[PDB]
């Protein structure tokens, strides 16, 4: 892929293009359970040093059950659940008479098995832990006979080792009420999770793309606890199904753009809204305002469309015509001509005002550009860093060709004393009204 | 607890009622203790494979208490403390000489004790785990003597497994510069805190309450580190006290309410401002305009009062008569007709604008209903998700009655012309005298 | 230092003096490796429990390094990345042939070596942690060879024990991208940051800084993970370096002004904008708008500048003349007269307004004073909370010196009629040329 960058200098924004979609659009669950054991405390005469170490981590068991009782007892909402509402609703029905017994019956034999459940949803379940059968055979004789059995100090090490991963499931589960995100390896090994993607109904470039970016998927999952019954523990864990693939993708980034008077209280700002992250989908375009929505891998953006908009096509040309019809180009104004710089993906956008010192320098040369007053641009190539201010900022060293788009900014085809200067989102054709409002109250006087 | 929605198609708003309160208005300060070894190294003549084991699991204490020393020297501010100062307080008191020697004996022969401090505080204490009494009973005879004595492998392990708890204190405590929440079960396990709860002075329907929601309690108590003097390891657990029970809550949800021209730039459009949880407390309202600021289980609400603003009870008003001269209901407009849903408790408010495509549909039914331009909104009863543009919402399947109250939309009752549309935070009077203004500038002309 | 406070109560606002600043301006990249085993699995006839146990940690050593090598292949983007820049050029260069082999032959026969790089940097490489002499001496000769040799139950151990690290460090890698902060001490453990520090390119007042403050420091570095390759496991641990030391840095704290009419819907307000850490800074001053990006220790503030803006040191006069033409103090306007308090470094604003409760008490004397309608200021000599509303705020017990700057609110100096009420970013001259507009409409009528 690509990488290309396009700085407008007529409106002080920047587009990084050449980047690939992978939107989710649907969630797969699964059903992940742990064979439990249904023991009851058992106390003989024990004094014997292994014998106490056992009943210590059969204690953290009996807890760690008893706590994931207590958790499952009452569970907390997290505000309208909705990007959970898919494994809630498989909980809701694993929680009815006889589908837990379905579940222990397809993995009675293997660890992995497709259910069909009694809602119509083929959901993949998996057995990653069997503590009833460590428990029951190595276990029992132990404390269940009369007086105590005398357990091989291997038993006493491997016990704390299969007793882990319960323990540490139950400490996720319990400080977050339940629902933890990303999902965990103690939830779903790396192993676990790459055969779980590959036994998805889905296509093998999904399977590739899932298990290429596994990192990627654990963060825009969910682990979702279920119920403790019948000797079982099961929880869902609802994985991502990008229903988006290989749209173009763009990111929108934009600086303020004042006008560079000398006396202050005389200048007039601008600066274009909705910056983010832009991909093609389903003929509009999914917009993705909030920062920490899309995480990038290579020249792939991989958002969640719950946190987007959805815009027409032509939310585009504000990038190639921001005065133009088809669309309403959004702007916020202000009189705050404060220096800043934004980091692009093949350069750095840089507002200079006042008697800030902006520059662009190489390691070994120095500097090797001093912005001017107003809205400027440099690429990477050749530049490591930009200072502003005290501030130094690092530019990104991805290779890629920018285009810088040459052209007056706009902020100085208006005049100021009719300019409305503290709009926080006003489009262009809102200030070019509420211009011609202000150009009657002055044409009648 | 029965829940109702109610959808104010006038206002493009709705109100889910029937939640009950549970606001912290106190704090419960305890002191959890760490009984510790105030040996040094020792060194003798050793090869053995198990005291190496041994000494290595003393130098992991020994690098613990040292670091729990360094982080006790200079303990970080977290912005104004005020809600860790009950905590604070109590750790300022417990540097005084002397106080650590009171709780050291009234936790000299039981692991809880109730200790009066020397500044009228009745805190309860805890010695959660005793490493003076394992490591001066079990290991001194195996270093400090002038030849290591061999130890039985039991004890290696046992000395594993106690020294945990301590490492993990202290590795929670240095990442979070000596303050951690939620609190952790290596801070206080469940069995502590659910014996803790008991142990407090307070009604028994607060134990119940507590007891029931511990997950939630956890996820709104402090643990703050005090002090290592004198093999003592002391710090504060901060638990919530819920001052305000049982008062009704509702939750506001908002949408933007636009009018429908076809030609952009002539519509105009406004939205209710302050969504949120709003609570009875003390013959006003507790607002909570902060999302993460309360915790909801089963109908009740779990809010911090902290983080509130004290409203008269007449803000009410603004869901049933937005135009009524008791209170200002505040608005803010603006000409940004974007689509966009809202999942409430009992069903989906959806803003439709433009060329969105917004439809309501059942699992195997399909769509069901299509929206039209304007606010709508759609019950849960028969609904199963909600889209709108390329977005896919889940409708929360919570059991309730919804009424929707129609009305003509106030929008409509705006001149166009006239109207304030990039207003950020105006009341309805406000826009009102704005456009009585607006009116004499024409008036005159 | 001396801790001062000044309340201005013609302007609601205060400010937090005598603070000192500790800006970070640099980064020290370091890299960190893990000595491997690039040994294969290898079955022989076993049995014996020792044997299971050994194999068993040996598969968990062996999905951790396949798990390393698989995010490995893919590193994802950190939202421009700029703030790790640092290390991520050293990661680069790291990938280059024959740079692993320079460190693996520095890091031959001591922990800790300094390697000049092949790009001109000098880093201080460390090797934490040595799996291939253990795996290649203790447990080859177990697996290795045709029939497995038994290993004694100290070797089970110590190999839990040494695998560890490896299995937590990959734990944090794959939850987190391969971009970890805060550090960790599994990242890097006390023990090694305070050595890395002490090892460091930096004087003898810095070292004692760092490590005065290693939690801070922590909390403001990275750890960047680099490759896997020929053996070696290594990853970039980023410090700060800070290159402003002990400048004046002080705290402006705001609360709405409004006036105090009892119809409402007369009453208007403005707030101070620009509340944060300021600290002076090479001529000068570095301002921090983001409540989180500052800790404060002690009266030693520790910011990073990359969330910094740089002003004009005239931007203090807005706190000694807001009406003073050298800087143009900005304000927000509104018509929202809610009650609200800010708790300060050394008391507590109150903004009251409406039927607000307001009172400031003493824990043993109750209520010592109640706040009239408007915006005032109590000091902490005496104070230990403050009421407003439903709420109660704990005064930070702080010693220090407040004054109150007595002064007319200036909020009464505006005509309501002409009052540019709704403001969201407007200078103090920006809203006195707005109301010489609206006077120039009603002078023409
Ligand atoms: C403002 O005036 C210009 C000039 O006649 C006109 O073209 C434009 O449509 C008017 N209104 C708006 C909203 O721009
Ligand atoms: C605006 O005009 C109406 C009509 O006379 C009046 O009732 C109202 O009080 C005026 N002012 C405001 C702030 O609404
Ligand atoms: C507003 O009017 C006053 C009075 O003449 C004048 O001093 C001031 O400069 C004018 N303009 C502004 C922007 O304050």
Same mark, same amino acid.
């Given at each position: 892929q690509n990488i290309t960058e396009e700085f407008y200098q007529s409106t002080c924004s920047a587009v990084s293009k050449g980047y690939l979609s992978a939107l989710r659009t649907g969630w797969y669950t699964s059903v992940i359970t742990i064979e439990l054991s249904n023991i009851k405390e058992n106390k003989c005469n024990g004094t014997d040093a292994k014998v106490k170490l056992i009943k210590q981590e059969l204690d953290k068991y009996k807890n760690a059950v008893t706590?994931?009782?207590?958790?499952?007892?009452?569970?907390?909402?997290?505000?309208?659940?909705?990007?959970?509402?898919?494994?809630?609703?498989?909980?809701?029905?694993?929680?009815?008479?006889?589908?837990?017994?379905?579940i222990k019956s397809?993995?009675?034999?293997?660890?992995?098995?497709?259910?069909?459940?009694?809602?119509?949803?083929?959901?993949?379940?998996?057995?990653?832990?069997?503590?009833?059968?460590?428990?029951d055979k190595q276990l029992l004789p132990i404390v269940n006979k009369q007086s105590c059995s005398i357990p091989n100090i291997e038993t006493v090490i491997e016990f704390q080792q299969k007793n882990n991963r319960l323990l540490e499931i139950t400490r996720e589960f319990s400080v977050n009420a339940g629902v933890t995100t990303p999902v965990s390896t103690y939830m779903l090994t790396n192993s676990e999770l790459l055969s779980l993607?590959?036994?998805?109904?889905?296509?093998?470039?999904?399977?590739?793309?899932?298990?290429?970016?596994?990192?990627?998927?654990?963060?825009?999952?969910?682990?979702i606890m279920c119920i403790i019954k019948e000797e079982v523990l099961a929880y869902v864990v609802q994985l991502?199904?990008?229903?988006? %693939?290989?749209?173009?993708?763009?990111?929108?980034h934009t600086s303020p753009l004042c006008t560079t008077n000398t006396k202050e209280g005389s200048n007039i700002c601008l600066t274009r809204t909705d910056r983010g992250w832009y991909c093609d989908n389903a003929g509009s375009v999914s917009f993705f305002p909030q920062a920490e929505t899309c995480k990038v891998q290579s020249n792939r953006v991989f958002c969640d469309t719950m946190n987007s908009l959805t815009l027409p096509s032509e939310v585009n040309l504000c990038n190639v015509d921001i005065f133009n019809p088809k669309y309403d180009c959004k702007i916020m104004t202000s009189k705050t001509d404060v220096s800043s710089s934004? %980091?692009?993906?093949?350069?750095?956008?840089?507002?200079?005002?006042?008697?800030?010192?902006?520059?662009?320098?190489?390691?070994n040369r120095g500097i090797?550009?001093?912005?001017?007053?107003?809205?400027?641009?440099?690429?990477?190539?050749?530049?490591?860093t930009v200072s502003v201010g005290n501030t130094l900022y690092y530019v990104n060293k991805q290779e890629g060709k920018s285009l810088y788009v040459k052209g007056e900014p706009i902020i100085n085809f208006y005049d100021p004393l009719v300019f409305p200067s503290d709009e926080f989102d006003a489009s262009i054709s809102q200030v070019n009204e509420k211009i011609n409002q202000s150009l009657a109250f002055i044409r009648k006087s």
């Amino acid at each position: 892929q690509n990488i290309t960058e396009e700085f407008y200098q007529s409106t002080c924004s920047a587009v990084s293009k050449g980047y690939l979609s992978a939107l989710r659009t649907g969630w797969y669950t699964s059903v992940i359970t742990i064979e439990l054991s249904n023991i009851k405390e058992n106390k003989c005469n024990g004094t014997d040093a292994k014998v106490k170490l056992i009943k210590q981590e059969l204690d953290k068991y009996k807890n760690a059950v008893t706590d994931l009782q207590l958790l499952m007892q009452s569970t907390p909402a997290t505000g309208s659940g909705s990007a959970i509402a898919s494994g809630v609703a498989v909980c809701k029905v694993l929680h009815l008479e006889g589908e837990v017994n379905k579940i222990k019956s397809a993995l009675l034999s293997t660890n992995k098995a497709v259910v069909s459940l009694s809602n119509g949803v083929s959901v993949l379940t998996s057995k990653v832990l069997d503590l009833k059968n460590y428990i029951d055979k190595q276990l029992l004789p132990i404390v269940n006979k009369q007086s105590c059995s005398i357990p091989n100090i291997e038993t006493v090490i491997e016990f704390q080792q299969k007793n882990n991963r319960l323990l540490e499931i139950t400490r996720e589960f319990s400080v977050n009420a339940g629902v933890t995100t990303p999902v965990s390896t103690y939830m779903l090994t790396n192993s676990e999770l790459l055969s779980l993607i590959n036994d998805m109904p889905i296509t093998n470039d999904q399977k590739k793309l899932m298990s290429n970016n596994v990192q990627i998927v654990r963060q825009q999952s969910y682990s979702i606890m279920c119920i403790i019954k019948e000797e079982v523990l099961a929880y869902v864990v609802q994985l991502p199904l990008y229903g988006v %693939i290989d749209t173009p993708c763009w990111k929108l980034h934009t600086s303020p753009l004042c006008t560079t008077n000398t006396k202050e209280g005389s200048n007039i700002c601008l600066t274009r809204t909705d910056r983010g992250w832009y991909c093609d989908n389903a003929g509009s375009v999914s917009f993705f305002p909030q920062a920490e929505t899309c995480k990038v891998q290579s020249n792939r953006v991989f958002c969640d469309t719950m946190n987007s908009l959805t815009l027409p096509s032509e939310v585009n040309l504000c990038n190639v015509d921001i005065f133009n019809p088809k669309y309403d180009c959004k702007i916020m104004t202000s009189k705050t001509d404060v220096s800043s710089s934004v %980091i692009t993906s093949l350069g750095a956008i840089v507002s200079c005002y006042g008697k800030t010192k902006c520059t662009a320098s190489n390691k070994n040369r120095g500097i090797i550009k001093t912005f001017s007053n107003g809205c400027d641009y440099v690429s990477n190539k050749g530049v490591d860093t930009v200072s502003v201010g005290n501030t130094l900022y690092y530019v990104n060293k991805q290779e890629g060709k920018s285009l810088y788009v040459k052209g007056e900014p706009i902020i100085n085809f208006y005049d100021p004393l009719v300019f409305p200067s503290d709009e926080f989102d006003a489009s262009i054709s809102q200030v070019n009204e509420k211009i011609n409002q202000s150009l009657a109250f002055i044409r009648k006087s």
